Structures are given as structure tokens and as C-alpha cells.
Amino acid sequence: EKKDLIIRVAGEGGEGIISSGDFIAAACARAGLEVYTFKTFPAEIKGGYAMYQVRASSEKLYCQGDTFDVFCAFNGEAYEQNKDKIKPGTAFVYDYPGGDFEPDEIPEGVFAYPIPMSQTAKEMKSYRSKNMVALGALSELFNISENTLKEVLSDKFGKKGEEVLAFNLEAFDKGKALAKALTKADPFRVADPQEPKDVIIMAGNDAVGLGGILGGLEFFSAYPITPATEVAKYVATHLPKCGGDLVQAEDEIASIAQVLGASYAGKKSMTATSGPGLALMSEMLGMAHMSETPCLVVDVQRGGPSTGLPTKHEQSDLFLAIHGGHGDSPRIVLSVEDVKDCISMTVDGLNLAEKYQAPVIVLSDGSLAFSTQTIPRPKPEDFTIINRKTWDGQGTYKRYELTEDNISPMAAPGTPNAKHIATGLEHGETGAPNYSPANHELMHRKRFNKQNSVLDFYKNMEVEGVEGEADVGIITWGSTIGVVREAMQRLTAEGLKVKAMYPKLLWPMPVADYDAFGATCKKVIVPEVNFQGQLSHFIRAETSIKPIPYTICGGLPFTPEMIVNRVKEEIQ
Amino acid sequence: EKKDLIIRVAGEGGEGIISSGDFIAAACARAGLEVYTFKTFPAEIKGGYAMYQVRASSEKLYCQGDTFDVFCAFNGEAYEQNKDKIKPGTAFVYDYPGGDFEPDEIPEGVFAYPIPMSQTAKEMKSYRSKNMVALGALSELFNISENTLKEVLSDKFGKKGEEVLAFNLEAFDKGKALAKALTKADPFRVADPQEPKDVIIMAGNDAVGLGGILGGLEFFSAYPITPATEVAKYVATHLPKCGGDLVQAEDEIASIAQVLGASYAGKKSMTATSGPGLALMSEMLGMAHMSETPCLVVDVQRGGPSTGLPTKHEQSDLFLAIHGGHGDSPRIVLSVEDVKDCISMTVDGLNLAEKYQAPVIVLSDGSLAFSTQTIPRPKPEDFTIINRKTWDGQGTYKRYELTEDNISPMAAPGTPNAKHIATGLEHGETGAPNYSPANHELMHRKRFNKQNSVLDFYKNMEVEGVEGEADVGIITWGSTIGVVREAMQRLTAEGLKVKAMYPKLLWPMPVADYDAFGATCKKVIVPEVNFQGQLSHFIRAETSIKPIPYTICGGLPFTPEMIVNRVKEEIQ
Amino acid sequence: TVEAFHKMENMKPKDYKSEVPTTWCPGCGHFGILNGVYRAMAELGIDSTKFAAISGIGCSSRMPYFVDSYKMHTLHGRAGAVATGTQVARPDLCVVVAGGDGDGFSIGGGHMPHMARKNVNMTYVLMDNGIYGLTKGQYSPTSRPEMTAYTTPYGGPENPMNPLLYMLTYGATYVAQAFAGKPKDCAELIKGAMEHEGFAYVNIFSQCPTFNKIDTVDFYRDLVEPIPEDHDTSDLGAAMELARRPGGKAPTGLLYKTSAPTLDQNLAKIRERLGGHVGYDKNKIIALAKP
Amino acid sequence: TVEAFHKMENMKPKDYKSEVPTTWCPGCGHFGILNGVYRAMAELGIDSTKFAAISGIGCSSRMPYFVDSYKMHTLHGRAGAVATGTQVARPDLCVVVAGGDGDGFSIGGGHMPHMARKNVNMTYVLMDNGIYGLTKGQYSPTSRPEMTAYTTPYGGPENPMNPLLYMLTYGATYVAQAFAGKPKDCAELIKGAMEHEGFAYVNIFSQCPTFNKIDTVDFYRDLVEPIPEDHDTSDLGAAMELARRPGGKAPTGLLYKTSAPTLDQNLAKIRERLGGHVGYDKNKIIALAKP
Numbered sequence A, B: 001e002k003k004d005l006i007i008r009v010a011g012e013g014g015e016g017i018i019s020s021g022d023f024i025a026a027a028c029a030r031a032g033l034e035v036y037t038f039k040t041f042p043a044e045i046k047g048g049y050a051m052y053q054v055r056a057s058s059e060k061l062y063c064q065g066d067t068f069d070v071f072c073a074f075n076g077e078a079y080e081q082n083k084d085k086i087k088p089g090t091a092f093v094y095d096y097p098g099g100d101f102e103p104d105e106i107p108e109g110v111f112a113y114p115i116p117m118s119q120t121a122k123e124m125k126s127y128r129s130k131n132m133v134a135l136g137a138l139s140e141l142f143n144i145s146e147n148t149l150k151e152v153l154s155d156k157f158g159k160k161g162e163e164v165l166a167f168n169l170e171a172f173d174k175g176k177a178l179a180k181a182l183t184k185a186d187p188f189r190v191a192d193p194q195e196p197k198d199v200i201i202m203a204g205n206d207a208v209g210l211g212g213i214l215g216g217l218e219f220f221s222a223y224p225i226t227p228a229t230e231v232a233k234y235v236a237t238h239l240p241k242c243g244g245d246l247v248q249a250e251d252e253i254a255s256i257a258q259v260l261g262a263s264y265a266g267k268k269s270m271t272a273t274s275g276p277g278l279a280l281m282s283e284m285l286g287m288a289h290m291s292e293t294p295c296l297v298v299d300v301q302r303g304g305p306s307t308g309l310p311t312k313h314e315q316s317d318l319f320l321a322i323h324g325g326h327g328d329s330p331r332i333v334l335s336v337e338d339v340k341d342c343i344s345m346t347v348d349g350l351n352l353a354e355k356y357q358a359p360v361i362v363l364s365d366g367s368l369a370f371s372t373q374t375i376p377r378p379k380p381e382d383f384t385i386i387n388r389k390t391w392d393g394q395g396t397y398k399r400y401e402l403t404e405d406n407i408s409p410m411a412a413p414g415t416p417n418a419k420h421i422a423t424g425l426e427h428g429e430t431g432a433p434n435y436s437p438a439n440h441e442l443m444h445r446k447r448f449n450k451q452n453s454v455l456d457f458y459k460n461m462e463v464e465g466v467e468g469e470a471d472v473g474i475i476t477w478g479s480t481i482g483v484v485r486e487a488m489q490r491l492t493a494e495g496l497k498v499k500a501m502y503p504k505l506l507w508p509m510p511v512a513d514y515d516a517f518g519a520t521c522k523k524v525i526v527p528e529v530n531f532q533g534q535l536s537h538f539i540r541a542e543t544s545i546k547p548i549p550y551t552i553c554g555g556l557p558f559t560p561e562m563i564v565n566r567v568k569e570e571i572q
Numbered sequence C, D: 001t002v003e004a005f006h007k008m009e010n011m012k013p014k015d016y017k018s019e020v021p022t023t024w025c026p027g028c029g030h031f032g033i034l035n036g037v038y039r040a041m042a043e044l045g046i047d048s049t050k051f052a053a054i055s056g057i058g059c060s061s062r063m064p065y066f067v068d069s070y071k072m073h074t075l076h077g078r079a080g081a082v083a084t085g086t087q088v089a090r091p092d093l094c095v096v097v098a099g100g101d102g103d104g105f106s107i108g109g110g111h112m113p114h115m116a117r118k119n120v121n122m123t124y125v126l127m128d129n130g131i132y133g134l135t136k137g138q139y140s141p142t143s144r145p146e147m148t149a150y151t152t153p154y155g156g157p158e159n160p161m162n163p164l165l166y167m168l169t170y171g172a173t174y175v176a177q178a179f180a181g182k183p184k185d186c187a188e189l190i191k192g193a194m195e196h197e198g199f200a201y202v203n204i205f206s207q208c209p210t211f212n213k214i215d216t217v218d219f220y221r222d223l224v225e226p227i228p229e230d231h232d233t234s235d236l237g238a239a240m241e242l243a244r245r246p247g248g249k250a251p252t253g254l255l256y257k258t259s260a261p262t263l264d265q266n267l268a269k270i271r272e273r274l275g276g277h278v279g280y281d282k283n284k285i286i287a288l289a290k291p
């Protein structure tokens, strides 16, 4: 049985393609449904082809899906761009007649529903309301809750007047009549309204900004870069309310430098950037490792290399996150999967930075940045907050004192009798420069054993599927994880002996836990959106698994059918 | 049979310890001997423990040796640092009386020669000439060609004044009488001057500058960093003679930025830096890979992480050289071994950059940077020179045209009918921005297959040792190679079943040749001076060898006895 | 000596347009600057084969794509650095740098002083829209404090910097300012910037109607105040006063112009004093390493 | 509001010495500047627990190790950047930045203008020796052209930059210059720099006898020329003329001083207008995400 419906709407930006997608999401959310959206803006700021795809279901959603079930074209270019995907069995709504095109030979089996969208908008002497007519048409044909749909438009258009709201509502049911006038033959219906669960809708980047605030953020320093600038916008808006500060530095080096300055002063600090920014922060992240200063860097991964594809999808910064520092300069690297992790794991990042006095890197991606989801409404007391180990005042203070857990207690400025230095030079217990052989071996073992000890406290590598021996094991990271969840729903439903593992702690990696997984797997498939198979590289180097890399690098994420098809070939 | 002599001179920096060592090395070369020096000093200009060790032999040398035969202490700290190595059978010259220390109970059998060095310096009203009285004293005791010694110190100290030179010449023959007047009981004498074979003496960094010049360098941009500043000094001095230019940029980012700018203009360009600088160059090196612009970066590795140990010895930039770029951004990584490689492999770097239009990184280290060696006299026509593939003018030009070898012909500005763009954005054949999926896959395969084809053209991984099956195999890179060479002379002379392999092409790595080696080895030992065992990481990831990492991270290189002792442990 | 000037006869502005159509928003002030770049190349008869246009990252930095010449699209804020390597290696080329205010005085602010100090013979056309355009509307080092933008919803917590004053202090040997709404003012000042042998800086106000809602055409139209002709373009002190905007009005015209050695010339003297040339006997250099 | 001034009574310079012995060469001018920092801290009765000394990379940057206070030894050219994060996070501390001429106006020249522009309440003590000391004598942005140095055996192919003129143009609200051989000039100007609320820059000539052979003590003593007291320290134009060295002589004293809002104050106004505080009910922020 099909419980979800995938609706893709496309057209010229400015005709309300993005807003119409958000309204459908809010309507299904008010009706107690799970929503998973994904949008693309036009490739140029001046205008062009915009695309929004909303997925509503009665059960949990984990990715975008294989392809759309319902497509809605506002003009001819939207049709030609998606013509390859308008396959038999799918519903097709388009702007006809009155539009700027007549559809080609519609393949036999395609449920076509021509709706004069531009005509009814022109008949009302207001082309601005073209997107409202499609909302009424899609609400009728595929059972979108009209009461919640008109409520979302009321909350948005009520502040302009009573005649502004009543006019757009008239365009809605005008398209509702054009729709119900046609013969509904498609088997596609949005699940019926359930009890509205206590949830919220949030985009991934906004979730990172919230996760920082809920995690005790006090200082944020940013420099704009696509697709991570949104995080600074959320933090610049809301963090000043909570007594914190955001500063827009002159570049990424200055931004991460300011983070260390505020972290040495005792404040929880972080920054957000993308690929090119992380590569500029490499030298300062090594300083963070050497001086043992806590700091958080969220890298919303975009396409590379170099300037690359700033707006496309790619998870290719794992080589840089782990080996990006000169000398032996390790980092704590995490990678989120959904909007949920963008809040919890940004909290976890600040905590692990506080707990281990080390640079922490949180890997996101460009899709997850803009994708909006329905997540359980968060409460500030739901999250564990960790703070840096503070000196008890007893004895004589040493900033880099050798302890049993290698974590030297910290002291913010102003603490009496705790004057110390944080330094980038190799040093002794008091922070003084020390070039001796035995001290370098001693301090490397202090800082490495300290950071490696995260494996004894942070465990985020879920396993689902069959419990016994499996024909094929699947290991993936990032937002590809959610794609493999839905792929595992289908593979297990056919009774295949497959299991999956979803690492979210990337470095250091629990080598022993990897071997425990790959021991019960005849073959291991590692799907990731990067050219070199970067996670597969660290699996061959550190564990005993010999994996099978399933690598794509075209600026697009995986779909569940791609994963399912790849597994069945290796089952044999 | 012992053919070599090791003379170590130590003292407080600023007392001329390094200058005295260079004179002894130059004197042994005039006597037709092979020389291998090694120096260590503190990161501070005028104080700390300074050490110079010169090695003269009648056969080829490959490292500094296990320990000294003759030791000379200028002060008390020099004595205590080497006291454990002042074992019976060694000669001992020290500053007494009048120094700042009195040596403890000198063990029976140690040929002690107390020389009042600091006393005579105060007697001449010039403490700067303190090291010359020790220089004159050492010349007598061990038959250093005294005639050449006054010539080399005159050329270096003639630019200081006429009264400073007359004082240093007075200290030489003052110490000359104190030494041979004493009863010579040591069995250590430098061989009498023979005909000097056709060689030259050169420091590692100075040799890198020469190899670049001989390889057709036209533009050099540098920013000072220890221990890489010397390369800029040699290049600034001599490259203007050969029609080239050197510019000191404002930072390492500007430095590598200018290199690409001059290389896009059509000239062979390069730069030299160290750990912190390479980490600052990470973003621009990615631009070089994406735009397919040739450029060379010589990274003289120092101690890390962060500011680290700027003057010590370490090969810890392998993680940064290969994975230092965001996205999939590979580099061609080489690693030199001796002063010979500092010329030949710097030519190879410029050649491999020109031939494959890619960023090339040549890794050196701090010891080899300052070590001076005797190498055969080079001739400019001895070296193969490769130039970038230039457009023939036929047809319509495309900067990133797809060809059979993936190498698009280049065209310097001014070339008619060849107006083009070099870009960091993902692009098509003509350089225009192209974000389509199939093009990203196509261009990733173009640039990777291009750079990966170096394995089909450049092979620098010598293998020596036993011909059949071996009990233990040794794989190492950098200047550790020469240390393992001397270790292999001792292991093979006793008839042990061991073989060694010396990779000098590090990335991309010839996986097939590595597996061919590891097939004939029961155990494989990878000695390297870095904390994480960085080459061992790339050995486990890309090859089938399961190596044994022998990792030290104390700012000191290996010695042959350390390798030999480690080998015999794994044999049985 | 630049060898790209006066090599082509009877050239029109449209002769330097490339096959790439423009991507800018309708009304964007960068169009005025681009058309001024065309007219300047045409009035000089430039053989664009000996013309190099190097840009960083930003809406302003997409201009080289629209120019028919040799061109480079590098990283954010490093164009002037990369262009320096080009200009030194090939002093014959006409080198021009194009970029925005954020590209130039934010991430690229470290390379600005050394370009003008060393007096590299190149032209810097900075298109000042007072905002970060391509990243969708964050405030810039030239943004006014009262403006509310992407990452500054509650106003700008600092004052703007003076681009003309920076370059005059840094020692630029040709400083001019223009408005994009006067495309023949841009073309003339850009023309003299290219002919000038030295580092020529041209600050041009370019409206961004999509994201900057207060620095509009009407605002820039009133902000300008043309420099009087009796102004002395050799008086650095008088030019710095004009740069400091007397009476709140920004100057347009030529502020400062002077002749001084360029970087490639001083680098050449080093080679000339050594008798250096391409066919030097490299064995002479190797001979110095003999024992 | 800085809470570290006038908190300790009967303080001597030696109370601010740390357990770390000095590493500088005998005769180096950095000893005078360190001694000027000591006397300045003593005359203010500074509780050094609320004192932050942050440095970059270089001989000059080794100074924090020798001061008994909270301190940081950061990366090359990033001291002023790291210090800004320190000052903003804890506006109560007295923040001081120490570093060399190469550290500040070469790799760190990108962070210089924004420090002074945003008027961060901190003091910048720049030790100007006209050379790269710790890396053994390469010329710097302040080296004179005729000097022959490590990477410039045939002279400098560019002119030096003006540190006072740069900071005046960038908009620093306290600009002074001193000589290391006048340890009571250093102590006074550093004292007024710390009490000043704003970005205070103090350019201090410091000889380097080990590597710099022409910028000697005798040279610096003849180069200086103390500012007359009738000079108006509120006249920016007069201070810029003083910085440009009338008659070839470099000024010593107070050049420019003015009161203007600091970065942490403007950051505070943003929180004040919002009624922001640590105990904000964060659930209001999450409520905006309800569908």
C-alpha cells in the first residue's frame, strides 16, 4: 500500500513556485502529516526555472523519493525540463489552455489534467494570483486539506486586509472548480487528515542555527558563502535575544580566529561555512588542536573541487575534515542526516568541543541546507548541555597539566591565580615552548588519546535490518543515510538478507564496531556522493572491511531505487 | 672496517657553532672526501642548544650516522646533552678552564683534550672569536687541511670588517699550538688531502633552488618560513641571471596566487614554504587542479601541528599534501631523499606540472634542508626538460577540450585565435560554467585520469636487498630513505633475508608495484618520522600490505642502529 | 611597455562582446561598467589578444565572461594577487582586474595595499554596490550603517571605509571615481587607467536594485559631485581631501595621477644590473658550488 | 567597561614579570617595549587577571610569554583577529596585541583595516624593526628600498608603507609613535592607549642589531622628532600630515585621538533594543517554526 504522495511543482520564479510548496507543507503539517520538502531556486538571481517538490505521508519520511507522482508545470520550460520523468502512471497538471505551450504527444497512460492557470489569473485581471489557482486545483485533485490550506493563506495574507485575502481565496476555488470539472482518474491521493501532532517545520540551515542556540552558543562569527549563509542569518536574528553576539568577519580565517579568541575568553563559539571556507580555516584549526581550545565549525558541503558547483549536492569534504591540517592535527568530525540532527548534532558539536577542548567539524550538505522537514517540537530541557572542565582552584594552575584522561582543566580570564597562555608552539605543562624529543612524544600522546577517547562517550552509528548473517551490508553517511533507510524498508519487505549501518561519528572512527558489522556481511556496499569514495578510503585504511564503493558525483543525491538496484546486483 | 669519521660540534647559539661546522665540511671536500652534515638549533636566534655534526668518509654517505667519534663542547649544556654518548673510545675536546662548567669524572679510555677557549677569547678582547680557537685546535688534532680552513673563514668573515678577521685568524693559530702540544692518543685522523673528485657541496634548500633554475624556472614567489626561506634566497640571487624574476609576496596565499597568475601567463612558476604555509595554500591549490593550471609547491616539512617545532625534523605533511583540498581535489606528491634529489626531483616537479597541468607538491624536511652533501657536478643539459602541451593553432581553440590523453593544449595570452578563460567553477570544454550532472562526471574523469596517468610515465620507487623471498620488508619515504640505506648495508652484510623499497612518488601511488613488493615479504616495516604513521595509512587504504608502523615524533631523524634494532626484533 | 594598445583600426564597442550572454538582473549597475569597459577598449584600438581580464568571486566578478579577451576566474579576493603574477611574468599584456567591494576590501583587503604600494602596472575596476550581491544581500565594507541586510537585520554595527582614501594612502598612482549611470564617464576614466603605467584604481558606484534598497540610482545620482577642472591631480593632499567627501558629496573624475617606476621595471633593473638574460651559462651558477 | 584599571595598589614593573626568561638577542629593542609595557601596567594598577596579551608570530610575538597575565600566542598575522574575538566575548578585560612589522602589515594586513574601522576597544603595540627578525633577516613592508637583505640581495623593488598613515586612514581612534630607546615615551603612550576606549595603535621603532644593519639605534634616534604640544590631536588632517613625515623626520608622541562608539557597545545596543538577556524564553524562537 502507498502511504505517501510526491508532488513536484515547477515554473518561472516569481510566479510563486517556492511559496506554493511551503503552503502545501504547512497544510499537511496542520493536518498531522509528515512532510519532507526539497526546493531549487533559479540558477541566476535575475529569474529562471524554479522547482519545489513536497512529500506528504502518514508515516515517517527519510528522503525525497525516487521521482514525483504528481507534476505541475506553470509553463513550457518546466514541462521540457521534466519531460523525461513524465512516465506512464503519473499525474500531470499543466497550464492549458492559455499558457505559453501545448504539450507534446502525451505518452499513453499519463493522467493529464489541463488546468487554465494563466487564463483564470488573467480573467481576474491579476496575473499575480496565478499560483493560487493551482493550489485550489491540486487541493481538489489529490485531497489536500482545504481547511488547513485556506488557514495557511489566511495567516499569511490576513495582515494585508480583508479584500486582499478574499481575492486570493476566490482564485483558489476557481481552480477548484476547473479541477473537479475534470475526470479524476489518477490513483494518487494525499492521506486523510490525522490528529495534528505537536511538531514544527524547519529548514536544515535554520536547524543548525537553532541547535547552536539551544546548545549554549554565545559567540558566532560568519562570512557569507553558499549554501551556508542562512545559518548566520538565523543566528544574527535570534542569538542577540539570548545575550549572545554575531559578528560578520572580513573572511573565513578572521572568522575562525575570532572563534578561538572568544573561546579562550570562556564563551561557547562556532562558525559556519562551506568547502572553500574550510580549506582556508585549515591552519587555524591546527592551532585549535595544539592549544586545546574548543571550537565548532559547521561545513555545509557544496560541490567541488574549487568553486565547483555552489548550489548542487555533494558530500566530498571528508578528506579535508580529517586530513586538512599540517602535521599531525586530528579533528572530531560529525555529519548530520536530517533536520533532526541539524539541531541535536550541533548541540553535540558544541558539547564535544567543550568536553574535549578540540576543534569539532559538523558536515552538512547543500540539499539538507534548504530541505524543510516536520520534526517533533523541541524543548530546551530535552538536550544535555556539557561545559568545559573548570579548575577547582586547588594548588598551582597549569593550563596543559597531564591528567589521567588527558583533559587539562580550563580557566577563563578573570579566574584568580589561573593566569596562563594558550600557544600554537609545542609546549610543556605550563605552556612554555618545549622542543625536546620526549616532550613532543608526550604531548602528542596526550592530545591524541584525549580526542580518541570520544569513542568512550559519543556513540552514533545506528544499525538496522536483519540480526543474523546478511548477504549484503550497507554503510553510508550524511543525508545519504535517510535515502538508505527507505531503501532498507523496501529490501527487508521482500525478505532479503541485508543490513545497514549509519555512521554519524566519522573521525575518530570505531574500528572495532566496523569489524563487528562487516563480520556478519558477505559483501559491503558504501554509497556516497563523492568521486573518490572517501568513506570507503578510511574503511580500507583503518578497518578490516574490504568495501564495494558505490560513488556518484553529478551534483545530485541518491534515490532509494538506485540503492535497491545496486544491492540486488551484488546479492546474486 | 670503519671508513668514516663523525665530528660533532655543539654549543650555545650565537657563538659560531654552525659557521665552524661548515668550514670543516668544506675542508674535507677539498681533500676528495664525501661529506654529509647535520645541524639542529632552537627556534630562537641567539640562545639555546646548537649542534653541528660533519661526516667525512671515503665512500658514499646516506645519513648522519649513529653517533659522533669526536665531540667538541663549547659550554656546559653542550656537555650534558651529549654526555650519554661520550662513551669510551671517543675523543672529547671541551672548554676548560675558563668555561661555565667542569666535566664530571671522565670515563677511562676517553681521549680528553681540555682547551681554554673562552679564556683566550677574553684575552684577545673579542669574545666573538671564541669558536675560532676551537677551530684551530681541532685542525691540528685530527689533521684538517689547515691551509683551506683560513681561506673559507676569510671569505665568510671578510664582510664583517678588517679588525674582526685579524682577530679570528689570531684565534686559529692560538688554538693550533695548544692542540698538537698535547699528547695525541686518539686513533682518529682525517685522511690526507687527495685529488678532489668532480663534485659540488650544496645544502638541501639551496639545491632545490638550483634544480628549479635548471628546470626552466621563470617566476618564483616566496614568503619566509623556516626551514624553507633558504630556497628563496638562492632563487632571488641566481634566477635573475637566467631571465627570471623572484617576488616576495605578502603571505603564502598571495604567494601561490601569484604562481598561478604567472603560470597562466605561460611561464614556469613555483614556490617554497612549510607546513603552516601549505595549509594556507589549500584553497588555491584546489583552483590549480580544477582550472588545470601547472604550479609547483615545495613544502620543506617542519615539526607540527600548528606552530609546532619550527626548527626540528618531521615528515608529517603527507596527510595535508594529499587530502588538503575541499572536494575531490588531488595533487601529485613527491618526496626527496638527498641533495641529489633536491635538484633532479625539483626538475621532475616542474616537468610533471608542465606535462600534466596539475598542482605538484614536493615534500622535503628540515634535516635535509640544512644538511650539505657532496654530489656529482651537474650540467644543464644532463636533465630532461618537459614543456606544457601548446595549441598548434589549427581549428577552433577550446581551453578544456576533451582529448585522447585528457591533456588539453595550453595557450599563453597573446597567442592569436586562442582567447579563453581559466576558471575554478565547474566548466565545459570552452571554460563556461556548467553545473550539469553528466559534465561533472565527465570532467572529474578527465582530470583524474589525466593525473593518474603519471603512474604510466613516472616511476621512482627503487628496490634493493635480497632477490628471493624476504623475512622483513622495509618501506620508507623522505630522508629516512638514506637512513634505511645504511641500515640495509648492515642487515645484508650479515646475511639476513631482508629487502627495502624507497617510494619517491607518493601520490598517486603505484598500487600494483607495492603489492608486487609485499608479496615476497613475511613482514613489512614502515619507518617514518610522524605520529600517526601517515604513509602506513595510505598503504593500508590503497594496497593489500598490512604494514608495521615504526613511528617516532621527537623532532629527530632515525639513525641506522634504530632501524637495524627494529628489524632484528621482527625477524626473530 | 604594454603592447596591446592601438593595434586595431576602426573598432566599435560591440567588437569586444563575447558569445556569453549577460546573466545580471535587469537594472543592475554592472551593465553600465561593462559597457564602459567596451568603449574604453574600442577607443584604444586594443588587440584583445594581448588583454588579460582577471576577476575574483561575485556578481561583479562575472564580467570577464562577457569580454572577448584572455581571462581568468579565480578565487574570492585573490584576483589582484593572481593578476600580479600575470603582470610580472608578461609586462607586455594589458592586465585588468574586475570585482566587487566585498571581494576587494573584505576577503581581498590584504592584497590591496601591496598592489598599489609596489605600483604594479594594472587596472583595478571595483564595482561598489555597498552589498554582497551574489550571496543574496549581506552588508559590505562600504555598506551604510543604517542599512538592514541578510546578516545585519538590526543595522550595521560599524562604519563604512573609504575606498578612494585607502588606495591614495596605499600609494596608487591613478585614482578615479565614477557612477555606473554615466557609462561614458566610466569609459573615459577606465581608458586613462589603462594607458597609465602604474596601478590604476577606479571606484565605480553600481546600483544593486535586487538586494540594496537604499543605495539606489537616485541616491547615487545625488551623491556624486564632479571634480572641478582646476583641481590639481598631482596634489596628493588635495586628492585625499576630495576622497574624504567634502560636504558629504562623493567626487567623480580623476583625483590623482603620477608617474613612478612600476614593479616589472624595478624587477627588470635587477636583471639589467646583473647582465641577466635567457641564454646565461648556467654552469657559471653551478661553478660557485665547487669545493 | 574595562574593570582591570586601578585595582591594585603600590605596584612595581617587576610584579608583571612571568616565570619565563627572555629569549631575545642582547641589545634588541623589544626589551625596551616590554619594559614600557611593564611600567604602563604598573602606573595603572592593573589586576593582571583581567589582562589579555595576544600575539602573532615572530621575535616580537614572544612577548606574552614574558608577561604575568592571561595571554595567547596565535598564528602569523592573526593576532588582531583572535584578539577581536577575545575583546567581544569579554568586554571587561584589557586586551593588548603585540607583534612585528611583518606580522602586522604583511600577512596580517587584511585584518588591520577592520580592527580600526570597527573601533574594537584594544591596544595594538606594533614593534617596527623594518625586517623579518625570527626568520633571519628578510625585508618587510617598512624596510627602506636601498637595504640589501636575505631575499633581496640586490635591493628592495618597492617603497615602504606608512604604518601611522594606514591606521589613520583605517580610522583608528588613538594613533601614537615612540622609540624603544625612550622607555618613558613607550610607557606613557602605551598607558594612554590602554585607558582609551577604542582601537589604539602604538607604532614603536625597535632596533634589530642581529640582522638589520642600516635601521640602527643611531638611525632611529636621528629619525625621530617629538610632536609639539600645540598640535591638535583632534585634527585628522594634521595627524595625517604628521604621519607623512614633514622634512623626512618621523613623529613621536600622540598624533590623533577621538571618542567614538566601540564595536562591543554597538553590539550591546542591538541586544538592548531587543530587550535581550541570557534568560530569554527560547521557546518563543521555536514557536515561529510552527506551521
Ligand SMILES: [C]C1=N[C]=C([C][N+]2=C([C@](=O)([C][C]C([O])=O)S[C][C][N]C(=O)[C][C][N]C(=O)[C]([O])C([C])([C])[C]OP([O])(=O)OP([O])(=O)O[C][C]3O[C](N4[C]=NC5=C([N])N=[C]N=C54)[C]([O])[C]3OP([O])([O])=O)SC([C][C]OP([O])(=O)OP([O])([O])=O)=C2[C])C([N])=N1
Pocket (backbone or CB within 6 Å): A425, B012, B013, B014, B015, B016, B017, B018, B019, B020, B041, B042, B043, B044, B045, B046, B047, B050, B128, B129, B130, B131, B132, B157, B160, B164, B168, B224, B225, B226, B276, B277, B280, B307, B310, B311, D057, D058, D059, D060, D061, D075, D076, D099, D100, D101, D102, D103, D104, D127, D129, D131, D132, D133, D134, D135, D136, D140, D210
Ligand atoms: C603562516 C606562517 N607563515 C610563516 C611563518 C614563519 N615565521 C616565523 C616562525 O614560525 C617563528 C615561530 C616562533 O615564534 O617560534 S619561523 C621560526 C624561525 N626561527 C629560526 O629559524 C631559528 C633561528 N636561529 C637559528 O637558526 C640559530 O639560533 C642560529 C642563529 C643559526 C645559531 O647560530 P650559531 O650556531 O652561532 O651559528 P652562525 O650561523 O655562525 O651564527 C652566528 C652569526 O654570527 C657570526 N659569527 C659567528 N662566528 C663568528 C666569528 N668567528 N667571527 C665573526 N662573526 C662570527 C656568524 O657569521 C653568523 O652571522 P650571520 O651572518 O649568520 O648573521 S616568525 C616569522 C616572521 C617574524 O617577522 P616579524 O613579524 O617582523 O617579527 P620580528 O620581531 O621577528 O621582526 C615568520 C614569517 C609562520 N610561523 N606562519
Ligand SMILES: CC(C)(COP(=O)(O)OP(=O)(O)OC[C@H]1O[C@@H](n2cnc3c(N)ncnc32)[C@H](O)[C@@H]1OP(=O)(O)O)[C@@H](O)C(=O)NCCC(=O)NCCS
Pocket (backbone or CB within 6 Å): A013, A014, A015, A016, A017, A018, A019, A020, A041, A042, A045, A050, A128, A129, A130, A131, A132, A156, A168, C136, C137
Ligand atoms: C526566487 C524568487 C523569485 C521566488 O519568488 P516566488 O516563487 O514568488 O516566492 P515568494 O512567494 O517567496 O515571493 C513572493 C513574496 O510575496 C508573497 N506572495 C506569495 N504568493 C503571493 C501571491 N499569490 N500574491 C501576492 N504575493 C504573494 C510571498 O509571501 C513572498 O513574500 P515574503 O517575503 O513575505 O515571504 C525570489 O525569492 C527572489 O527574487 N529571490 C532573490 C534571491 C533569494 O533567494 N532571496 C530569498 C533570501 S534573501
Ligand SMILES: Cc1ncc(C[n+]2csc(CCOP(=O)(O)OP(=O)(O)O)c2C)c(N)n1
Pocket (backbone or CB within 6 Å): A223, A224, A225, A226, A276, A277, A280, C057, C058, C059, C060, C061, C075, C076, C099, C100, C101, C102, C103, C104, C127, C129, C131, C132, C133, C134, C135, C140
Ligand atoms: C573563499 C570564499 N569565501 C566566500 C565565498 C562566498 N561568496 C561568493 S560571492 C561573495 C561576495 C560577493 O560580493 P561582492 O564582492 O561585493 O560582489 P557583488 O556580488 O556585489 O558584485 C561571497 C562572500 C566564496 N565564493 N569563496
Ligand SMILES: O=C(O)CCC(=O)C(=O)O
Pocket (backbone or CB within 6 Å): A224, A225, A226, A227, A307, A310, B425, C057, C058, C134, C135
Ligand atoms: O557562482 C559563482 O561564481 C560563485 C558563487 C559562490 O561561490 C557562492 O555564493 O558561495
Ligand code: SF4
Pocket (backbone or CB within 6 Å): A045, A046, C023, C024, C025, C027, C028, C029, C030, C059, C060, C129, C133, C134, C207, C208, C209, C210, C211
Ligand atoms: S544580485 Fe545585485 S549585483 Fe548581482 S546581478 Fe542582481 S542587481 Fe546586480
Ligand code: SF4
Pocket (backbone or CB within 6 Å): B045, B046, D023, D024, D025, D027, D028, D029, D030, D059, D060, D129, D133, D134, D207, D208, D209, D210, D211
Ligand atoms: S633577531 Fe632581531 S628582532 Fe629577533 S630578538 Fe634578535 S635582535 Fe630582536
Ligand SMILES: [Mg+2]
Pocket (backbone or CB within 6 Å): C100, C101, C102, C103, C127, C128, C129, C130, C131, C132, C133, C140
Ligand atoms: Mg558588492
Ligand SMILES: [Mg+2]
Pocket (backbone or CB within 6 Å): D058, D100, D101, D102, D127, D128, D129, D130, D131, D132, D133, D140
Ligand atoms: Mg620585524
